[PDB]
Subunit: 231 residues, 4 copies
């Protein structure tokens, strides 16, 4: 365990630093900016490169909703969960700190006013979507995410392909939901960035813990008590 | 069969929710929108992530044209077809419903006036292309799609790579045909979205059932009676 | 041979129809257009999906420069070359014909004036680059392309990954050279489209036969008499 | 060794010619330009296609920070390092020369004034970021890069997937850091292009040798003395 947690910490740090870093540093860059499609690719790739680099160690969760989701689907032991969830929040926060430091090297930076890539709904939704819209998309996408993780980790097809299926799945998820909640489906990622925004983000933070997790559990039971295995 | 259909339902739901969701939620977002290239990537990725997650269960069709296409090429039994085709239409429609619900959380939403990512030709073609143009591209692309599916499912090269070849093939198909018909090549996907547009989409719906299917059958016989196997 | 040629024909048709189709149908679409990055992805993906679908049959060349390049590197028999090169030109031309038909379904279409995705230099170069610039980039990129094909087909690492390495390599090649020559590195692709442009394209056609081929041969000998094998 | 160096030379040439070529030839092309997301994809793909083509020969470094990084992590012998580092700088410079020649075929070209895709900080940073910001991102990203390389080269999961994990990792790195330093994490790449810019680039060159390397060493020891192996 004194090695599987390091991978957890270093993985969620990569995800935050990369995904959110692309969001605050290059998403809106004038003319040459990467936009949502670029940030969506980044997030997915942080997971794909780390799932290949440290997946054969901790399993490549880098997400509390994924950990607690592998538990519900009956594939990840209990109490080890807490160890992962904490390492995930820490790694994300560290990354968010260095990110904030890097972004501060440019005149006019304002993590409060800009949002600092924080997830939010209603008045804090990128496309101005209602809290209902945020709940539905976040839940469905979260459920589907874990459903793909489970099927891809199943012992009947992948065989080294899981990193690609999971990483691209996260990319797809951002191509859909960024306009709604800016896309979370990962409590560790929402917390890491809400802390530095220190305002409204920290007030809706609770939402991106429950829905992502609930949805994640739903998807774990769906594949468990409805798909494969049987015998 | 009480497990292969669930995968069919959950797969076509993923495809619709994701592909069409990106189309109605983020394709045209101001400045940071993903555009056609983004929607094209999304569609392809829904198939790729689900083909890896539930392909080793149902075969990963998520498309009536693909099912009926694997039958013509002589690789998919009869009557089981009907079971798949229905599960595919249901999953798509469910997704279209939740999508409509999510999109409704934003002021000014109008599935009738916006089209709601519906396929269409002539006056309902994105680039204003004639019905002829729609027929040709939809047929050729549909035939090629199934031709790639067959070769990638062949027992002489892939070996776990089929999900990538099929998923990217669908992405490619949207990079070409969105301006023409908004890209269908999947009856289940055209129906799911035409129902909520409830106007012209439901009037041209028939077109995106026959051509996609006919073209799909053409491609299944082309690889069967012209490529590989032999012995 | 009465099966390996069909794959050749159907593959180069896919490449032209898809790569050039994205170029003339969606590259410049208003606001939502895919641009060069989109066309570059399309071209690469036509090769990747067909290399997986019909590569375990003909080897997946879909390019005269690749065929004649595998011969120089000492990996592809003679005279069979002519069989491939002809099937490649035919498949490309057929696709170019259907493409022209599809593009004609939209008011204002003009293959002569628009260029119809034709390769060219000097006054017919997208970025207005000199013939020298066209020669260098086309040669280097063509040499590198075949160098990657050879190494990826080598029996010491890939093992089913060749389609990905070759397909993405072609994508990369378009991200660099479209502004220069609109990117050719494939005689079959330049001919298929120059015929319908019927003007200047048919006058510089010769250039995109020799350089692509010469460069292709250079890369085949470089990997042969400088890399791997030895024993 | 008289074969592993050729791959080193030809690989770093590919990386420079492709990555930087896309940067100077098509990144800013009017309306249809590929932007940062396009250049980021190019760089990553040069590594991915060459890692598959000549990785089973030299190991696919194409980067002095990667070579010296595999040494610190205890996976790459000494003195052979110097052989690689030199072949890498040469290949990059050759490519930079041909690139400069190609770019010269277009009226108004000015490698001094345009920067010629050179890395830089402060007043020479694309987004105008402080030297501190440049140090942090370059170090972290460099450390993470080698951390992914090590885990992906580990003998417990990849098995032919390393090229994908490493190539996409470099893409991700550019989606984040281009606005800051224009992204280096590769001394050979910074030198190849600074020589032709011949001005400020050659004055900050030292920075993109030390930080990339230091960060690279940090990541090599992190995976070595903190992750996997054990027994
Ligand atoms: C490893 C480094 C961890 C450091 C954690 C730092 C947390 C700082 O958190 C504070 C917020 O709570 C505050 O409201 C905002 C805005 O003014 O400023 C941040 O820096
Ligand atoms: C891991 C860190 C746990 C985060 C929980 C933070 C709870 C604080 O929540 C409060 C909000 O309720 C308050 O209105 C805003 C206004 O600026 O200040 C926040 O810090
Ligand atoms: C492991 C760390 C767990 C962090 C969970 C943080 C949950 C957020 O908790 C905060 C509350 O404390 C705050 O007062 C309300 C106001 O509406 O906003 C919530 O989001
Ligand atoms: C570990 C994550 C659990 C988060 C604990 C959240 C405790 C507070 O939860 C309440 C919500 O239930 C309430 O409806 C909203 C606003 O209307 O205010 C929040 O603070
Ligand atoms: C599982 C949920 C399935 C629900 C299916 C709902 C189908 C509704 O279908 C109707 C259309 O027929 C109508 O014309 C349009 C526009 O006013 O409104 C839609 O909601
Ligand atoms: C699975 C659902 C089957 C869909 C078949 C729908 C057939 C209805 O088709 C009619 C059109 O012909 C009519 O002109 C339009 C105008 O608003 O109304 C539609 O509902
Ligand atoms: C399994 C469900 C099959 C759905 C097939 C729906 C076919 C569409 O059918 C409708 C007709 O009923 C309508 O009146 C005409 C008008 O031109 O438009 C067609 O598209
Ligand atoms: C299951 C899908 C089959 C669809 C059944 C379609 C039945 C109606 O089909 C007719 C077409 O043949 C006719 O030409 C067009 C418009 O000119 O009107 C349609 O409604
Ligand atoms: C299988 C179908 C193959 C058909 C080949 C058709 C070749 C036509 O080629 C002609 C050009 O030579 C002519 O100059 C241009 C512009 O006016 O018109 C084209 O259609
Ligand atoms: C496979 C088809 C072979 C193509 C070779 C074509 C050679 C014709 O080349 C001539 C040019 O030299 C002439 O100036 C232009 C002007 O419109 O007309 C072309 O058709
Ligand atoms: C298998 C088919 C081979 C096709 C090769 C076509 C080569 C092009 O050949 C044409 C010449 O015939 C024409 O007159 C000159 C004018 O400068 O332009 C060339 O490109
Ligand atoms: C099969 C492809 C071979 C192509 C045959 C080309 C024959 C003509 O080649 C000549 C070139 O050598 C000449 O320099 C240019 C223009 O300055 O005119 C061309 O037509
Ligand atoms: C294999 C080819 C290697 C050739 C190396 C050429 C190095 C040239 O380097 C010079 C710079 O030092 C000079 O300041 C700039 C700007 O005026 O011009 C460049 O060409
Ligand atoms: C492999 C090549 C090694 C590169 C090291 C170059 C060291 C030269 O460094 C000087 C700078 O210090 C000087 O101020 C600028 C101004 O134009 O000129 C440069 O050439
Ligand atoms: C193998 C080749 C190694 C190249 C290392 C080049 C290091 C750059 O070295 C130069 C110095 O020589 C110059 O005078 C200062 C000015 O501030 O700028 C540095 O970047
Ligand atoms: C091989 C790469 C090593 C590079 C050698 C660099 C030697 C010079 O290094 C100095 C830096 O230490 C100094 O702080 C900066 C500017 O303030 O000027 C540079 O030239």
């Amino acid at each position: 365990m004194f090695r599987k947690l390091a991978a957890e910490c270093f993985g969620t740090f990569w995800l935050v630093f990369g995904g959110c870093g692309s969001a605050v540093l290059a998403a809106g860059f004038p003319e040459l900016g990467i936009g949502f499609a670029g940030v969506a690719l980044a997030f997915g790739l942080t997971v794909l490169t780390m799932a290949f680099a440290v997946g054969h160690i901790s399993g490549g969760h880098f997400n509390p909703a994924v950990t607690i989701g592998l538990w519900a689907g009956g594939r990840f032991p209990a109490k080890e969960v807490v160890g992962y969830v904490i390492a995930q929040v820490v790694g994300g926060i560290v990354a968010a700190a260095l990110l904030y430091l890097i972004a501060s090297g440019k005149t006019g930076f304002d993590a409060a006013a800009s949002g600092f890539a924080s997830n939010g709904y209603g008045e804090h939704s990128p496309g101005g979507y209602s809290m209902l819209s945020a709940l539905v998309v976040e839940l469905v996408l979260s459920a589907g995410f874990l459903l793909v993780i489970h099927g891809a980790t199943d012992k009947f097809a992948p065989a080294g392909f899981a990193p690609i299926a999971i990483g691209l799945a996260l990319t797809l998820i951002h191509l859909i939901s960024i306009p709604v909640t800016n896309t979370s489906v990962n409590p560790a990622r929402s917390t890491a960035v809400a802390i530095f925004q220190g305002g409204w983000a920290l007030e809706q933070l609770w939402f991106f813990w429950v829905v992502p997790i609930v949805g994640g559990i739903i998807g774990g039971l769906i594949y468990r008590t409805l798909l494969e295995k049987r015998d």
